[PDB]
Amino acid sequence: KNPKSDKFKVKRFHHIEFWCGDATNVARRFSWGLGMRFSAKSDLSTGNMVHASYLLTSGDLRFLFTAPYSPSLSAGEIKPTTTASIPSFDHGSCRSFFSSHGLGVRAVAIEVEDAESAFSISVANGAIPSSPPIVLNEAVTIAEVKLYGDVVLRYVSYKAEFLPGFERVEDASSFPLDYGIRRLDHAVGNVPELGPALTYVAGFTGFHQFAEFESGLNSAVLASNDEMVLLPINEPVHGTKRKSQIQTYLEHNEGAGLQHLALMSEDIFRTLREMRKRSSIGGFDFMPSPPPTYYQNLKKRVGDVLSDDQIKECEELGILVDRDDQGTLLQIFTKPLGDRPTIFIEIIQRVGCMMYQSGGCGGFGKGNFSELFKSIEEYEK
Amino acid sequence: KNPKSDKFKVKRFHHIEFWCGDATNVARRFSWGLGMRFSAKSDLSTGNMVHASYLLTSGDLRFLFTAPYSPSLSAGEIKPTTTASIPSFDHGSCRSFFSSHGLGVRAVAIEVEDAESAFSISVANGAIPSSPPIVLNEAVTIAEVKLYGDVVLRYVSYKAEFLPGFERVEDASSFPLDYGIRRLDHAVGNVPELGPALTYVAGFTGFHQFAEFESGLNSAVLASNDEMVLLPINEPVHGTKRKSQIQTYLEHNEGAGLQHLALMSEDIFRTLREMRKRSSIGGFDFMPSPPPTYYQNLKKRVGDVLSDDQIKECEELGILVDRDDQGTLLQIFTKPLGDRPTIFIEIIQRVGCMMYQSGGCGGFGKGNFSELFKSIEEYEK
Ligand SMILES: Cc1c(C(=O)C2=C(O)C=CCC2=O)ccc2c1c(=O)n(CCc1cccc(Cl)c1)c(=O)n2C
Ligand SMILES: Cc1c(C(=O)C2=C(O)C=CCC2=O)ccc2c1c(=O)n(CCc1cccc(Cl)c1)c(=O)n2C
Ligand SMILES: [Co+2]
Ligand SMILES: [Co+2]
């Protein structure tokens, strides 16, 4: 059931912005590790005396890395005279965010028809304002409201190239890396209490609960009208044998924040080959692979969807597989992206639900908590 | 002339420590960009609840990357009960350093016979204490005094593996990269006033001025007894046509600090091939190459030292060449290592001065200011 109750017209995930201490080093690491091309910049070389911002792209996926310069460079500016390309940016907010949380996501940006209207309606329906709508060069409107913790939901809308004041990156420094990642599938928050977080966000968006079919968490998913903007939220379950990983997150993150970003690949096998090649030479590590019993058990679970060779390829790469009543999901998780055991990345590919492919086809892999548990006890023998 | 006036016995550069916002991402970028192996760690997985510290090595060169965790993880500790592996580390100092200066060098560490004695004698001769001598697991003593700005000179001494509490890195995550870098040749500070900085440092070390043979700077070099610890210092020259790059440093760095690290390669040609291969896929960029007239002029300057093929190879890679009365220097400079136009890296190889090779053979390339200027006007034609 989908009541299509969005209170404003939402299109797609537009970008994810990381707040960094040094944007250069994070962006270059992420570019090599994920196969994303350097596409735009806003920094000293473009006249921005406030913040350094570098954009990586792979398909429709946009990762933005931003860090503050010394406030002294812009001490004479006021907001009417600012050289920042992102008017919501604040030196003090950025430094406090990074000191409190370490490296992580500041903004989940969705593209909307009308960012001023999206902001107004949101705030009229309980959203905590974070940055009022601002029109950039009469072409792009950007607005921000609080999502959870210190993460904002950012609305962007275009009259008709990333943002004004950003410049396309020079051909020489823009090496066309590509490991097959194409778009952001979903973005997941960790919170202390799922109920109040769900009520708040669903309250100002009109996003509906996405139908779902001892692990330390309860979770629910909010979705836009066409279920292409997907925002799951987790809360810890206390009192378990193994301490909840959601609670460990909240502790090391200093509270709520973005837990993982799930990136859709058009060929998860090639993506994982390419990423695993680079794990130990500057890229990303992956969680420990499931035992072979897990892949033995795949024949019964997904033998109508994956061949024996396609299953062996999953075993080669540590890929996980889960199933809805509608589709099949292949997924794998990286180790944390930075120093703290907080944010990580999920690579996914979905099979089925053709009409184009409907959002969320195959679910989010929650059946893999049980199957992993079973397979490890089965492998123990 | 070398009076060998060291006030304590100094051995060699031991390591360079960067203070970071996220040590993971800087270290992984540096590892790939410079061909340095992950060798040791001190972090949550080793019981360190205070800071994440990752060590990269290439030959004798040691780069340490450190960032603070949330203070809440260690809120119950006191210095007698600390889990930090580096007792001088302070959350507030690290955050203030990084917020003020961005990514850069906090510690220039030299190995000495006796770090307690080195500290005491230093302070008795005017050094500003920064961290008193502390004995780690009865095996290693570490002490720190102020060098310039917020950079410390760190003394380390061993009774007889990097530091106690650091663990050797797992074979799988320790990929044996190597582009030919072997040791730190020199470490260079930028200051507002060269005279008072020279007097201070030479005053508490007994380091002597290293003999030297419109560019925007004045500089001098301090050296240990065998001239293997080399610490040049720059000050800006004001009132030039082109604004001094030293002054630009001081402005963007919020004052004095480490300007560049010069890394000796045992094969500068292979190092630069390997680094330039990776410039646009996560590694380091290099300053713009000199005009072809510069390499035409190399035949007259160094034709007795480099063949025509070895010169063409310099032109291929943008390598610079300078000459002492004693030796020849090949050098090249990276673009800034991070967001701000502050710290950069120099790759060098020295030819001559065999006895082993004496320190500083060939100088520091100050003749290349004139030769670059000449060659660009010559290329203009
Ligand atoms: C993130 C994630 C998802 C996911 O995407 C997600 C949503 O998108 C929607 C909300 C529910 C939800 O979880 C699905 C399955 C997962 C994981 C996962 O993170 N992990 C490792 C956990 C782990 C493992 C070992 C020790 C610790 Cl402390 C912790 C798993 O095993 N599975 C099976
Ligand atoms: C760092 C450096 C050295 C060096 O190692 C050093 C010491 O170790 C000892 C003290 C003197 C000293 O300088 C030598 C030569 C250099 C550079 C250099 O940095 N540069 C680029 C500068 C530059 C160029 C263009 C615009 C701007 Cl704003 C700025 C050069 O050209 N040469 C020729
Ligand atoms: Co997920
Ligand atoms: Co130098």
Swiss-Prot record, chains A, B:
GO BP, one annotated term: L-phenylalanine catabolic process
SUPFAM superfamilies for the chain: Glyoxalase/Bleomycin resistance protein/Dihydroxybiphenyl dioxygenase
Question: Which Pfam families does the annotation name?
Answer: Glyoxalase (PF00903)
Tell me if Cytoplasm is a UniProt keyword of this record.
yes
Query: Which InterPro entries does the UniProt record give?
Result: 4OHPhenylPyrv_dOase, 4OHPhenylPyrv_dOase_C, 4OHPhenylPyrv_dOase_N, Glyas_Bleomycin-R_OHBP_Dase, Glyas_Fos-R_dOase_dom, VOC
Chain's role: Catalyzes the conversion of 4-hydroxyphenylpyruvic acid to homogentisic acid, one of the steps in tyrosine catabolism.
Q: Which family does it belong to?
A: Belongs to the 4HPPD family.
Question: What are this entry's molecular-function GO terms?
Answer: 4-hydroxyphenylpyruvate dioxygenase activity; identical protein binding; iron ion binding
Q: What class of enzyme is it?
A: oxidoreductase
Subunit and partners: Homodimer.
User: What protein does this entry describe?
Assistant: 4-hydroxyphenylpyruvate dioxygenase
A GO cellular component annotation in the UniProt record: cytoplasm
| Cofactor names | Fe cation
Instruction: Specify the domain of life of the species encoding this protein.
Output: Eukaryota
- Pathway(s) where this gene product acts: Amino-acid degradation; L-phenylalanine degradation; acetoacetate and fumarate from L-phenylalanine: step 3/6; Cofactor biosynthesis; prenylquinone biosynthesis
Tell whether Repeat is among the UniProt keywords. Answer: yes
Q: Which EC number applies?
A: 1.13.11.27
Q: How is the cofactor bound?
A: Binds 1 Fe cation per subunit.
Task: List the catalytic activities from the record.
Answer: 3-(4-hydroxyphenyl)pyruvate + O2 = homogentisate + CO2
Compartments reported by the entry: Cytoplasm
Keywords, sorted A to Z? Cytoplasm, Dioxygenase, Iron, Metal-binding, Oxidoreductase, Phenylalanine catabolism, Repeat, Tyrosine catabolism
The VOC domain extends over 12-158, 183-335
Q: What is its main location?
A: cytoplasm
Task: Summarize where Fe cation binds, as residue positions.
Answer: H186, H260, E346
